[PDB]
Amino acid sequence: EQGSGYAADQKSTQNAINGITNKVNSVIEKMNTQFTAVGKEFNKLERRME
Amino acid sequence: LGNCSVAGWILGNPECELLISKESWSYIVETPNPENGTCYPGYFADYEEL
């Protein structure tokens, strides 16, 4: 009788977005070191190495 | 490849003379201990690479 209205809850959404930030920062910070994976060169006689 | 080794066959070992006349194929086969291989003794230079 007194009115109406939409809304968005805060605590559920706040915990959820905390989960989102945790998930993104996890996936970005759970990759370890990177190595210089340059394709090296070898002769035409030693390519067992290659 | 039958009895001759790869060293034997590429050198035309006189025990797989019958192997001469096939020039197209799919995949080599090798008996694990080929005996009639390199008939004249020695040391194939860079055998594994070839």
CSV table of N, CA and C in Angstrom, one decimal, chain A:
chain,number,residue,atom,x,y,z
A,1,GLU,N,0.8,-1.2,0.0
A,1,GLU,CA,0.0,0.0,0.0
A,1,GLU,C,0.9,1.3,0.0
A,2,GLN,N,2.0,1.2,0.7
A,2,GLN,CA,2.8,2.4,0.9
A,2,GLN,C,3.7,2.8,-0.3
A,3,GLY,N,3.8,1.9,-1.3
A,3,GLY,CA,4.7,2.2,-2.4
A,3,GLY,C,5.2,0.9,-3.1
A,4,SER,N,6.4,1.0,-3.7
A,4,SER,CA,7.0,-0.1,-4.4
A,4,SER,C,8.5,0.2,-4.6
A,5,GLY,N,9.1,-0.6,-5.4
A,5,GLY,CA,10.5,-0.3,-5.8
A,5,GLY,C,11.4,-1.5,-6.0
A,6,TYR,N,12.3,-1.3,-6.9
A,6,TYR,CA,13.4,-2.2,-7.1
A,6,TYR,C,14.5,-2.1,-6.0
A,7,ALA,N,15.5,-2.9,-6.1
A,7,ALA,CA,16.6,-2.8,-5.2
A,7,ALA,C,17.7,-3.7,-5.6
A,8,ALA,N,18.9,-3.6,-5.0
A,8,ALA,CA,20.0,-4.5,-5.1
A,8,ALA,C,20.6,-4.7,-3.8
A,9,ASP,N,20.8,-5.9,-3.3
A,9,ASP,CA,21.3,-6.2,-2.0
A,9,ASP,C,22.8,-5.8,-2.0
A,10,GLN,N,23.3,-5.6,-0.8
A,10,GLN,CA,24.7,-5.2,-0.7
A,10,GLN,C,25.6,-6.3,-0.2
A,11,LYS,N,25.3,-7.0,0.9
A,11,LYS,CA,26.2,-7.9,1.6
A,11,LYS,C,26.4,-9.1,0.7
A,12,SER,N,25.3,-9.7,0.1
A,12,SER,CA,25.5,-10.8,-0.9
A,12,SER,C,26.4,-10.4,-2.0
A,13,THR,N,26.1,-9.2,-2.6
A,13,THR,CA,26.8,-8.7,-3.8
A,13,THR,C,28.3,-8.4,-3.4
A,14,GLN,N,28.5,-7.9,-2.1
A,14,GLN,CA,29.8,-7.6,-1.7
A,14,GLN,C,30.7,-8.8,-1.5
A,15,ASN,N,30.1,-9.8,-0.9
A,15,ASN,CA,30.8,-11.1,-0.8
A,15,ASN,C,31.1,-11.7,-2.2
A,16,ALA,N,30.1,-11.6,-3.1
A,16,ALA,CA,30.3,-12.1,-4.4
A,16,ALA,C,31.4,-11.4,-5.2
A,17,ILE,N,31.4,-10.1,-5.1
A,17,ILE,CA,32.4,-9.4,-5.9
A,17,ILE,C,33.8,-9.6,-5.2
A,18,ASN,N,33.8,-9.8,-3.9
A,18,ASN,CA,35.1,-10.3,-3.3
A,18,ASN,C,35.5,-11.6,-3.8
A,19,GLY,N,34.6,-12.5,-4.0
A,19,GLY,CA,34.9,-13.8,-4.7
A,19,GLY,C,35.4,-13.5,-6.1
A,20,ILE,N,34.8,-12.6,-6.8
A,20,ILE,CA,35.3,-12.3,-8.2
A,20,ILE,C,36.7,-11.8,-8.2
A,21,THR,N,37.0,-10.8,-7.3
A,21,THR,CA,38.4,-10.3,-7.3
A,21,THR,C,39.3,-11.4,-6.9
A,22,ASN,N,38.9,-12.2,-5.9
A,22,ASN,CA,39.8,-13.3,-5.5
A,22,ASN,C,40.0,-14.3,-6.7
A,23,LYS,N,39.0,-14.5,-7.5
A,23,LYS,CA,39.2,-15.5,-8.6
A,23,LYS,C,40.1,-14.9,-9.7
A,24,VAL,N,39.9,-13.7,-10.0
A,24,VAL,CA,40.7,-13.1,-11.1
A,24,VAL,C,42.2,-13.0,-10.6
A,25,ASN,N,42.4,-12.4,-9.3
A,25,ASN,CA,43.7,-12.3,-8.9
A,25,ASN,C,44.4,-13.6,-8.6
A,26,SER,N,43.6,-14.7,-8.3
A,26,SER,CA,44.1,-16.0,-8.2
A,26,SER,C,44.6,-16.5,-9.5
A,27,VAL,N,43.8,-16.4,-10.5
A,27,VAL,CA,44.2,-16.9,-11.8
A,27,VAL,C,45.3,-16.2,-12.4
A,28,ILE,N,45.5,-14.9,-12.1
A,28,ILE,CA,46.6,-14.2,-12.6
A,28,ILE,C,47.9,-14.4,-11.8
A,29,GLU,N,47.8,-14.6,-10.5
A,29,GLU,CA,48.9,-14.8,-9.6
A,29,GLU,C,49.2,-16.3,-9.3
A,30,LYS,N,48.5,-17.2,-9.9
A,30,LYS,CA,48.8,-18.6,-9.7
A,30,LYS,C,49.5,-19.2,-10.9
A,31,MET,N,50.0,-18.3,-11.9
A,31,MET,CA,50.9,-18.7,-12.9
A,31,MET,C,52.3,-18.4,-12.4
A,32,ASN,N,53.2,-19.4,-12.5
A,32,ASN,CA,54.6,-19.3,-11.9
A,32,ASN,C,55.4,-18.5,-12.9
A,33,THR,N,56.8,-18.6,-12.7
A,33,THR,CA,57.7,-17.9,-13.5
A,33,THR,C,57.5,-18.2,-15.0
A,34,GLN,N,58.1,-17.3,-15.8
A,34,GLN,CA,58.1,-17.4,-17.3
A,34,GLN,C,59.6,-17.6,-17.7
A,35,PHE,N,59.8,-18.5,-18.7
A,35,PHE,CA,61.1,-18.8,-19.2
A,35,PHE,C,61.3,-18.3,-20.7
A,36,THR,N,62.5,-17.8,-21.0
A,36,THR,CA,62.7,-17.3,-22.4
A,36,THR,C,62.7,-18.5,-23.4
A,37,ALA,N,61.5,-18.9,-23.8
A,37,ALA,CA,61.4,-20.0,-24.7
A,37,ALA,C,61.7,-19.7,-26.2
A,38,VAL,N,62.9,-19.1,-26.4
A,38,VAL,CA,63.3,-18.8,-27.7
A,38,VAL,C,63.7,-20.1,-28.5
A,39,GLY,N,63.2,-20.3,-29.7
A,39,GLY,CA,63.6,-21.4,-30.5
A,39,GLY,C,65.0,-21.3,-30.9
A,40,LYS,N,65.9,-22.1,-30.3
A,40,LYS,CA,67.3,-22.0,-30.6
A,40,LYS,C,67.6,-22.6,-32.0
A,41,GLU,N,68.9,-22.6,-32.4
A,41,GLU,CA,69.3,-23.1,-33.7
A,41,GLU,C,70.3,-24.2,-33.5
A,42,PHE,N,70.3,-25.2,-34.5
A,42,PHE,CA,71.2,-26.3,-34.5
A,42,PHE,C,71.6,-26.6,-35.9
A,43,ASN,N,72.7,-27.3,-36.1
A,43,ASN,CA,73.2,-27.5,-37.4
A,43,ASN,C,72.3,-28.5,-38.2
A,44,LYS,N,72.7,-28.8,-39.4
A,44,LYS,CA,72.0,-29.8,-40.2
A,44,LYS,C,72.5,-31.2,-39.9
A,45,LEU,N,73.5,-31.4,-39.0
A,45,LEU,CA,74.0,-32.6,-38.6
A,45,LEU,C,73.7,-33.0,-37.2
A,46,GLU,N,73.2,-32.1,-36.4
A,46,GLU,CA,73.0,-32.3,-35.0
A,46,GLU,C,71.6,-32.2,-34.6
A,47,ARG,N,70.6,-32.4,-35.5
A,47,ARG,CA,69.3,-31.9,-35.2
A,47,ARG,C,68.6,-32.9,-34.3
A,48,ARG,N,69.1,-34.0,-34.0
A,48,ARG,CA,68.6,-34.8,-32.9
A,48,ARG,C,68.4,-33.9,-31.7
A,49,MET,N,69.3,-33.0,-31.5
A,49,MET,CA,69.1,-31.9,-30.5
A,49,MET,C,67.9,-31.1,-30.9
A,50,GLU,N,67.8,-30.7,-32.1
A,50,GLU,CA,66.6,-29.9,-32.6
A,50,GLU,C,65.3,-30.7,-32.5
